[PDB]
């Protein structure tokens, strides 16, 4: 889905 | 430099019926300030039980063509049939427990889901994609053996056979974080057909290479460290707020270097200051009032050099209207050191109507290819361009009018759309609005990328192959639909020229091989999320170039 700039989200180094 | 005459007397109205269901939504579109706003009415029709049967965008209401969607519901309100004008027709059946039983997509592919019997908890066992009969997925659940409980494997899907191979789960932490998993890939001459009961005749379809990856996590379940499939260890540290504050990489056989040595944050948890093991310090500035990103300042504290400093400006609503760079131009562009200002304007529906910026000089017209790089020797410059975009009332981009002065490359490029659909191709393919839906699947996937290029799709609507003229490129996906393989087969020189990429957790196994030998083997170690200032490490096991360093 279209979300805003990437700065808003929490850091994520490892997921699936 | 925002003009609010675009948005005067253009609200958004949701019209209701006597059941308080949204039967119309109303938009007002003004593209330029002097003219009048245009009312766009999107129509939503509801039946007597109160479900949204058919919906109609404002462009097809003017064409007097049909609705976009025609849905058929059951008595509970779940969709049994969905005749979309862009995605075709989907027939869905669920059982008593609202689990999927039978899905027929628009290409006529019947998907099954068989579960456990009535003496078992009814977990998913297999998935059959009938076109002529392929058991394309197979789930192996675990028991409560004390060997399974030692690794917290009880009640999990240990072996998960999918459309790309096997994903075996080995260990779980006390939170439920996977601490060890392994995965093999299906060979190139085989597709996923996991029929039968014995699994010994399923390993002869898988590759010999079992790629296992390992993690360690704290009591909060946050990932502390991660070993890749080759042995390269990333290691993270966390501060007292639970955020991430550091990162260390130790390659296999080497010491431990520093990738991120500091990472502080704002009050809202946004990134504030980050110094890398590079030494370069980036610093994010925010609005006080709205907490919007208004600055990315990348500074190298060895030459007092600001490599980039992007200051953003916004609308009141949060549309980026001005990016200026207060840095100087890099070493690749001789004789100029001022980066131009990027300005943007929007419609009343907040869609981009105009955009300025800088582009290279020998770029030419934009297409699927990327231009040649600007080396530090060929003393080339950049020029100023401006693009202007045009849309129809369905929100489809219909025309990009790239006008670049001082080079005389003024070109327009049109997207030719249908009358009944939002399916629209480039104007090179077809100029007729009636022969656009012949370039798509029944599910609405495009089947020809360019005039000499065709696309092939899976039963579940994923890109199986981009056929070029002489050289194809095919992919593979797991059960979630994420890409696990990309095999580019270039044509015959004297034999095939094959480039293979394997996507692993934190590792890309990019390899290039001819007929009998591998001519290049590259292990790209990734650190972090892409788009979140990712760091890559290119390690060459075989076939390194001469001039680059390992």
């Amino acid at each position: 889905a279209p979300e805003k700039g990437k700065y808003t989200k929490e850091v994520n180094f490892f997921d699936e | 430099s925002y003009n609010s005459a675009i948005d005067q007397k253009t609200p958004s109205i949701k019209v209701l019926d006597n059941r308080k269901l949204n039967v119309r939504t109303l938009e007002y579109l003004r593209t330029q300030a002097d003219e009048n706003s245009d009312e766009l009415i999107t129509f939503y029709e509801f039946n007597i039980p109160g479900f949204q049967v058919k919906s109609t965008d404002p462009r097809k209401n003017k064409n007097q063509s049909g609705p976009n969607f025609i849905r058929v519901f059951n008595l509970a309100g779940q969709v049994l049939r969905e005749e979309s004008v862009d995605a075709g027709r989907t027939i869905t059946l669920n059982d008593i427990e609202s689990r999927p039983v039978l899905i027929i997509n628009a290409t006529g592919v019947r998907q099954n889901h068989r579960y456990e019997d009535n003496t078992l908890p009814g977990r998913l066992l297999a998935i059959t994609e009938q076109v002529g009969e392929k058991t394309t997925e197979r789930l192996i659940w675990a028991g409560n053996t004390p060997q399974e409980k030692d690794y917290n494997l009880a009640g999990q899907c240990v072996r998960h056979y999918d459309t790309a191979g096997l994903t075996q789960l080995n260990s779980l932490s006390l939170a439920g974080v996977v601490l060890s998993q392994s995965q093999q890939l299906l060979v190139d001459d085989k597709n996923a057909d996991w029929t039968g009961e014995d699994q010994s005749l399923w390993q002869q379809k898988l590759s010999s290479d079992v790629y296992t990856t390992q993690n360690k996590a704290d009591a909060t379940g946050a990932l502390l460290t991660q070993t890749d499939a080759k042995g390269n260890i990333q290691r993270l540290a966390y501060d007292v707020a639970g955020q991430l504050k550091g990162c260390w990489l130790t390659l296999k056989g080497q010491a431990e270097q520093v990738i991120i040595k500091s990472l502080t944050y704002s009050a809202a948890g946004q990134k504030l200051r980050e110094e890398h093991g590079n030494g370069v310090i980036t610093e994010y500035s925010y609005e006080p009032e709205t907490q919007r990103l208004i600055g990315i300042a990348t500074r190298r504290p060895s030459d007092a050099k600001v490599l980039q400093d992007l200051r953003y400006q916004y609308d009141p609503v949060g549309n980026v209207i001005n990016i200026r760079n207060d840095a100087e131009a890099t070493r690749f562009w001789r004789n100029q050191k001022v980066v131009p200002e990027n300005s943007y304007t929007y419609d009343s529906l907040y869609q981009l109507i105009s955009a300025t910026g800088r582009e290279m000089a020998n770029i030419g017209q934009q297409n699927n290819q990327l231009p040649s790089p600007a080396l530090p020797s060929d003393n080339n410059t950049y020029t100023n361009y401006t693009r202007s975009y045009s849309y129809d009332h369905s929100g489809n981009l219909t025309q990009i009018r790239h006008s670049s002065p001082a080079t005389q490359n003024n070109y327009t490029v049109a997207i030719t759309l249908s009358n009944r659909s939002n399916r629209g191709v480039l104007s090179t393919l077809t100029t007729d609005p009636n022969q656009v839906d012949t370039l798509f699947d029944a599910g609405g996937h495009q089947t020809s990328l360019l005039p000499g290029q065709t696309l092939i799709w899976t039963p579940r609507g994923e890109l199986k192959q981009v056929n070029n003229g002489p050289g194809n490129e095919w992919y593979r996906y797991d059960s979630n639909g994420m890409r696990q393989l990309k095999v580019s087969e270039q044509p015959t020189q004297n034999t095939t020229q094959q480039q293979r990429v394997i996507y692993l957790p934190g590792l890309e196994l990019r390899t290039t091989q001819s007929n009998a030998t591998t001519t290049e083997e590259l292990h790209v170690i990734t650190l972090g999320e892409a788009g979140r200032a990712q760091v890559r490490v290119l390690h060459w096991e075989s076939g390194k170039p001469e001039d680059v360093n390992n």
Binding site: - | A5, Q8, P11, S12, L75, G242
Partner: protein
């Protein structure tokens, strides 16, 4: 249906309070308040006892106004003292009169209850409430044999059976005649699942009371107190615990709710035990009650409400024989002052095992004081010119109207002065009008007087002359009734020494001739009098004679407060009272000490017995010259020290002067009117108080929330209504002849945010019924929610109710908002008769009486001072109906009142174009369950030429607002079916077994003017008749099991165990949705493989045979010995059975197990029945710990992860408990062995007085800080007793300066979460403080961050916004400011701080930019001004909503 999943309780951050809540005001006018007792509902069957305040309830064992009582069946004493024979009526537990239920009357002969031989043969009589609400039935068991006793049974419709007063411990009976029972108290209950409750009462005794108490009230061993309530049935049985006669608590119980009356220790830190060291306490306001023919004493107050568990029984160790341990404790504090005791403080206290106390901040309550020695004001009275008791003047009220007028009466004409409103200065200023000549007078002016001879509220001119005897009644609308002859008058009515008094107790004036040892009593029976008795007085009782002495006053007064006219003798030395026992009897005399005068200067004509405050007993006023002695009656036990009120300059008394006592002010309290008649009649008024005393004024939960309650009399609400009627030339009539002291303003203040909300009430159309002599309520209540945020318009809500009086109900509809001229026709009540199983339409008095308290209309407005201020936001109308279930010849019928159709409008302050709908009930069965319901959606009105929705909208919005789906009349019919279980030992009603929804749709030319209603849709050619096409929507069919057989039952059992539920999901029309992709030949094999079945339609019509249903929600239950508990439940027959498992006594689920074999065990903390150890499916332990209030504290987990044993170390290995101080736990470093800690602190809003400063100040300066209850005994400052103490002081000692600037933080808690396990040296502790609002809401959170730049907080709570480097940095995330109604009005951006403590709201409103939110009366958000300065906006119209973002409002 829920599959059971065991989980652990998480420690939340919303610090909630005790649970007190003020009731929304309605037509009754009183101010109520509830308070939940901490009953630990252990297995699922607990008592429903709560503390309830009502401003109007008298005294009690819980203080004044408060009452925590259990239901009982008592004889009706509003119609006089009971005769205790077959000619008596009973009151049910709801307070309504019971009648014998007809089938002829239900009379059967029974000797066996629940299989148990009772020993005698009883005459069981099924009773029934005469105004049916609950539809429970009541059996009066009474023995034919002499030797047994009578009792009651109540069969509530949810399967419960009650036993009321079988044993003498649960009967209030006459202490002389033990068969004369007056109150059958609830003794035991059985649920449908064989769970039992047993109620244990204690009798009154002569414990702790002096010899002056024991002389006057010798054998007062009749009044019962609920001592303890036993529940937690240790074995299942459907028989009562005391039918078999074998010691009802020798059966095991596991939970005991003990009510304490002073036996155990009441200090904060002593942990009271189950069995007590001492005896209960004899209180100070020992009142008395005589309405039953004997004396009820009520000598005790309830100090504590305790909760006990048998902990060694719940664990499988003991079997009910251990001592029950304390798990919960309430502490009720009272201000005893020998007139009334008032409950002033309630606190919940938990006790830890390490001899400490977990305490909540106390709910404290303040009452309106009666200090008439200070507040006594003298005022001149020139309004009453030439008023005179020597001539023919009177302070009385004709016209009803509740406030006395001035009547002068000549022999030819009468002159009146009605009380009215001064328009000048004050909202409660009362004056009298012109002398108006009355237009008609009853023309027989000889041998007559003004009195209410029949008691119907309106005064009568009772002419008892030589030839005729009879009366003319005075209607409130000015008219005089013609001559009504009395049916029977005694010849001794004209005796010179007979007098009219109230002896039988029915509120009527009986005729009595008092002799010294025998009275002659003629009973008033509301049409004349009855045959006279000669009641001989027992014992040594020699009654005083009225008038026969000039040195004594012998009159009928209530000097005990009981509500009876007792016989008082005021000598110069003592006051002796003979209690009226009803039926002419008089008890032994009671001496009330404290009154004394000079025997020479004592004249009884200056003695006036009048109740001054309103506590009930009559105070004693003796009049001197230049002063005025007042003796306060101390609950009918004596008189206090007198206090003098000296007469003003120019007033003296003599034998021509007169003292009147009347309520001439509308202030609820009587005023003393002194009249001096010689040389000009001049008058003075003494006003003792402003407000009516001992009502609840202020409350406080000591967490930042307090409510202040203000009261107004109904007399003032009539004088405002009467004055505004004469401004429009109308004639106002009052139907409430008595003052009702109503709640008028209840201001709410959040002390943290400073936001206030003032809900002002306005009443009109009071109704008092003359026949049943009962207050019917008000017919018009207003609310005005006006917020005071530290602008927004107040929200006025008019709302009418049905009174039942037809003269008041027919005037209500002339006060509605007409406005639009297109609305449908309004509703009228529907009187209906029930014969042959259906409602056929139509004792018209009882049909209107059933309409009391029904809603009739409600209109909501917003008072912004705009052009739409007078147009309502929404309009709701209702229609009540009354069904007569059985007829009543001389007794009342059984009537059932309900709202049968409700129509609601939605104007949104637009006159034309509303959005209307309607919900109609068509049929109901025998017990009031709906059989046919119709929901009506009305279409949009046609497009007018003139448009609303003003010019700020785009021009094309009005035409584009009209879809073709707004113009369809939609009807949704809804048929239902029910199971009613009827038997001699069976009453289970309202069990569903079938429902079905259909849909009817027509165009807008089929909705008629005057609307659709019940009389349209029930007709023969209606829009929902079975001749019209309907569309199927859904159906549902509940199937029941008997507990052991796989075949469902046709009729369920008493336990009502649901086997599964069957919901139709697919019909044969909907199978055409599978056309391209599913062959029709294989679809019924695919559908039956997915778990669908083909079942018939529910109420099937011609043309439909099968639906595809979804039969799901299965449960397997236990046997009767396992309390019918679920043991195995699955979702459907497609998946596997999930087998549950219970403990030894079947109260908690231990070890649920999946269908694959996956098991989740659980251990429970038996103090709260809370799971505190969870072993999951991989055998990893999750252990939590609770504090004494049940809130979770420190949790760990461990297990096997990679083949090795890891996790947090156990409590036996590394033992740790967090500090009780929040700031000390912040400084915790090093490896903690737990995953979380939790340090709660709800006491924090109370500032902490220190013991090191308390001993600094002086000793009598110390006890005034303790006896006023300002400090608590855990050293906390009460906000209500401090604020009340900072009024009378007004000079500033250091104790004054220390209290007025003491402060605390909002009620917060601290959660310390660790990153890694213990024994790992890199573990750091994440810290988080979470502040609450005091209303249960969440204010903010302070998360600990690393060292860096942050704003600094001052030492008083301000915010300095220059950044500085900080070693203790905290991030304030999610800060929110509310109003009093819960709507978020500020949302702050986060900011860094140097401290964890709360920053003040006045300083967070100046700095710390936020988004303010504006709302409307409905509660939706109109606009929001962002922090930078832009604003979004929303507009709500009935057919469309308009939204504007920050770009639309920028221009």
């Amino acid at each position: 249906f829920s599959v059971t999943e065991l989980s652990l309780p998480k420690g939340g951050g919303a610090i909630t309070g005790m649970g007190e809540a003020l009731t929304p005001a309605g037509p009754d006018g009183m101010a109520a308040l509830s308070l939940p007792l901490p009953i630990s509902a252990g297995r699922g069957y607990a008592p429903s006892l709560t503390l309830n305040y009502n401003s109007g309830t008298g005294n009690s064992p819980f203080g004044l106004g408060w009452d925590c009582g259990v239901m009982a069946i008592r004889r009706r004493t509003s119609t006089g003292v009971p005769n205790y024979d077959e000619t008596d009526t009973f009151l049910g537990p709801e307070g309504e009169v019971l009648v014998v239920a007809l089938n002829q009357a239900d009379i059967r002969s029974e000797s066996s209850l629940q299989g148990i031989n009772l020993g005698a043969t009883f005459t069981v009589t099924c009773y029934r409430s005469r105004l049916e609400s609950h539809f429970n039935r009541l059996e009066y068991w009474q023995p034919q044999t002499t030797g047994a006793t009578d009792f009651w049974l109540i069969y509530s419709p949810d399967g419960q059976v009650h036993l009321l007063g079988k044993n003498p411990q649960a009967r209030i009976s006459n202490p002389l005649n033990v068969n004369q029972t007056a109150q059958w108290l609830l003794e035991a209950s059985i649920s449908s699942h064989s769970e039992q409750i047993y109620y244990q009462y204690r009798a009154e005794d002569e414990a702790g009371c002096e010899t002056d108490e024991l002389a006057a009230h010798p054998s007062a061993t009749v009044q019962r107190y609920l001592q303890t309530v036993h529940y937690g049935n240790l074995t299942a049985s459907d028989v009562f615990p005391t039918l078999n006669g074998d010691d009802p608590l020798k059966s095991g119980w596991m939970f005991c709710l003990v009510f304490d009356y002073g036996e155990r220790k009441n200090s904060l830190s002593e942990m009271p035990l189950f069995k007590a060291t001492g005896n209960w306490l004899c209180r100070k306001d020992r009142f008395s009650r005589y309405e039953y023919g004997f004396e009820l004493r009520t000598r005790r107050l309830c100090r504590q409400i305790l909760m006990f568990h048998r902990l060694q029984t719940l664990s499988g160790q003991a079997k009910g024989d251990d001592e029950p341990a304390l798990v919960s404790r309430l502490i009720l504090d009272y201000d005893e002052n020998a007139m009334v005791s008032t409950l002033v403080s309630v606190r919940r206290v938990g006790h830890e095992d390490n001899n400490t106390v977990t305490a909540l901040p106390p709910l404290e309550l303040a009452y309106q004081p009666f200090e008439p020695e200070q507040t006594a004001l003298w005022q001149s009275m020139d309004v009453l010119a030439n008023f005179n008791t020597i001539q023919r003047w009177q302070l009385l009220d004709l016209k009803g109207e509740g406030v006395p007028g001035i009547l002068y009466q000549d022999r030819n004409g009468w002159w009146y002065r009605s009380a009215q409103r001064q328009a000048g200065e004050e909202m409660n200023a009362v004056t009298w009008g012109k002398m108006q000549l009355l237009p008609i007078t009853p023309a027989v002016q000889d041998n007559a007087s003004l009195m209410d001879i029949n008691g119907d509220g309106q005064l009568d001119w009772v002419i008892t002359g030589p030839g005729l005897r009879g009366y003319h009644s005075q209607h409130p609308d000015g008219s005089w009734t013609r001559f009504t002859p009395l049916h029977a008058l005694p010849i001794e009515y004209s005796h010179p020494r007979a007098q009219l008094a109230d002896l039988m107790g029915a509120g009527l004036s009986d005729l009595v001739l008092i002799g010294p040892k025998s009275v002659r009593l003629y009973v008033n029976n509301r049409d004349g009098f009855t045959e006279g008795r000669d009641v001989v007085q027992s014992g040594d009782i020699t009654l005083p004679l009225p008038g026969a002495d000039a040195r004594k006053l012998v009159a009928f007064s209530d000097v005990l407060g009981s509500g009876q006219a007792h016989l008082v003798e005021v000598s110069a030395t003592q006051v002796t009272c003979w209690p009226n026992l009803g039926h002419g009897r008089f008890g032994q005399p009671i001496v009330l000490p404290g009154f004394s005068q000079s025997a020479a200067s004592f004249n009884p004509d200056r003695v006036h017995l009048a109740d001054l405050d309103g506590s009930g007993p009559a105070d004693l006023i003796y009049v001197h010259a230049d002063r005025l002695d007042i003796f306060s009656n101390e609950s009918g036990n004596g008189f206090a020290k007198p206090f003098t009120l000296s007469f003003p300059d120019g007033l003296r008394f003599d034998d021509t002067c007169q003292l009147q006592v009347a309520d001439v002010q509308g202030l609820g309290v009587v005023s003393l009117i002194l009249s001096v008649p010689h040389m000009a009649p001049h008058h003075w008024r003494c006003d003792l108080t402003n407000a009516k005393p001992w009502l609840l004024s202020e409350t406080n939960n000591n967490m930042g929330a307090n409510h202040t309650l203000h009261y107004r009399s109904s007399v003032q609400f009539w004088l405002d209504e009467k004055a505004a009627a004469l401004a429009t030339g109308q004639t106002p009539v009052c139907y409430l002849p008595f003052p009702v002291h109503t709640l008028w303003q209840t201001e709410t203040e959040d002390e943290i945010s400073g936001n206030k909300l003032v809900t002002t009430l306005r009443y009109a159309h009071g109704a008092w019924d003359g026949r049943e002599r009962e207050f019917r309520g008000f017919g018009y209540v207003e609310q005005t929610d006006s917020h005071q945020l530290a602008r927004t318009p107040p929200a006025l809500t008019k709302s009418w109710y049905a009174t039942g009086l037809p003269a008041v109900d027919n005037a209500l509809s002339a006060g509605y908002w007409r406005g639009d001229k297109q609305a449908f026709a309004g509703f009228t009540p529907r009187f209906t008769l029930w014969k042959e199983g259906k409602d056929v339409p139509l004792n018209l008095y009882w049909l209107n009486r059933a309409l009391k308290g029904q809603p009739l209309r409600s209109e909501l407005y917003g008072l912004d001072g705009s052009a739409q201020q007078q147009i309502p936001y929404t309009v709701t109308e209702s229609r009540p109906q009354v069904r007569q279930l059985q007829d009543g010849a001389t007794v009342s019928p059984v009537l059932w009142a309900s709202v049968v159709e409700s129509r609601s409008y939605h104007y949104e302050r637009i006159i034309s174009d509303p959005q209307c709908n309607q919900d109609i009930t068509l049929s109901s069965d025998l017990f009031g369950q709906p059989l046919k319901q119709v929901s009506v959606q009305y279409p949009r009105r046609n497009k007018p030429t003139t448009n609303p929705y003003p010019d700020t909208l785009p021009d094309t919005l009005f035409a584009s607002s009209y879809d073709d789906q707004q113009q369809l009349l939609r009807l949704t019919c809804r048929q239902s079916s029910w199971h009613h279980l009827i038997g001699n030992e069976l009453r289970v009603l309202g069990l569903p077994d079938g429902t079905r929804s259909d849909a009817f749709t027509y165009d807008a030319k089929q909705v008629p003017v005057d609307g659709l209603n019940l009389e349209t849709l029930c007709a023969e050619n209606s829009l929902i008749a079975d001749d019209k096409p309907r569309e199927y929507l859904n159906q549902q069919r509940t199937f029941y099991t008997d507990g052991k057989n796989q075949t469902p039952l046709k009729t369920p059992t008493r336990q009502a165990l649901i086997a599964f539920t069957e919901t139709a999901v697919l019909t044969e029309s909907l199978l055409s949705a599978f056309d391209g992709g599913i062959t029709p030949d294989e679809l019924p094999g695919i559908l039956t493989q997915a778990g669908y079945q083909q079942e018939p339609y529910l109420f099937p019509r011609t043309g439909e045979n099968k639906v595809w249903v979804a039969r799901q929600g299965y449960t397997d239950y236990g046997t009767e010995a396992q309390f019918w508990r679920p043991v195995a439940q699955r979702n459907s027959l497609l998946t596997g059975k999930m087998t549950l498992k219970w403990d030894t006594h079947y109260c908690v689920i231990t070890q649920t197990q999946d269908a694959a074999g996956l098991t989740v065990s659980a251990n429970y903390d038996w103090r709260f029945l809370t799971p505190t150890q969870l072993t999951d499916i991989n055998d990893n332990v999750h252990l939590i710990t609770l504090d004494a209030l049940g809130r979770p504290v420190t949790q760990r987990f461990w297990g096997i992860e990679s083949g090795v044993a890891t996790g947090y170390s156990s409590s036996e290995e590394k033992p740790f408990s967090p500090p009780n101080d929040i700031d000390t736990a912040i400084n915790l470093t090093g490896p903690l062995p737990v995953a979380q800690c939790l340090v709660y602190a709800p006491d924090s809003w109370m500032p902490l007085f220190s013991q090191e400063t308390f001993n600094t100040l002086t000793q009598e300066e110390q006890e005034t800080l303790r006896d006023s209850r300002i400090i608590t005994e855990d050293w906390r400052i009460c906000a209500l007793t401090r604020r009340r103490w900072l009024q009378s002081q007004k000079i500033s000692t250091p104790l004054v300066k220390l209290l007025t600037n003491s402060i605390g933080l909002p009620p917060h808690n601290l959660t310390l979460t660790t990153d890694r396990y213990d024994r790992d040296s890199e573990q750091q502790i994440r810290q988080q403080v979470a502040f609450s609002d005091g209303f249960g809401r969440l204010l903010q959170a302070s998360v600990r961050h690393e060292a860096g730049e942050a704003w600094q907080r001052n030492q008083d709570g301000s915010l300095v916004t220059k950044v500085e480097n900080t070693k203790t940095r905290w991030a304030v995330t999610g800060r929110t400011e509310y109003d009093n109604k819960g709507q978020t009005i500020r949302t702050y951006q986060p900011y860094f701080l140097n401290d964890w403590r709360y920053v003040s709201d006045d300083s967070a409103r100046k700095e710390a930019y936020a988004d303010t939110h504006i709302y409307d009366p409905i509660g939706r958000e109109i606009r929001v001004i962002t922090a930078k300065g832009w604003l979004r906006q929303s507009q709500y119209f009935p057919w469309f909503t308009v939204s504007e973002d920050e770009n639309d409002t920028a221009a």
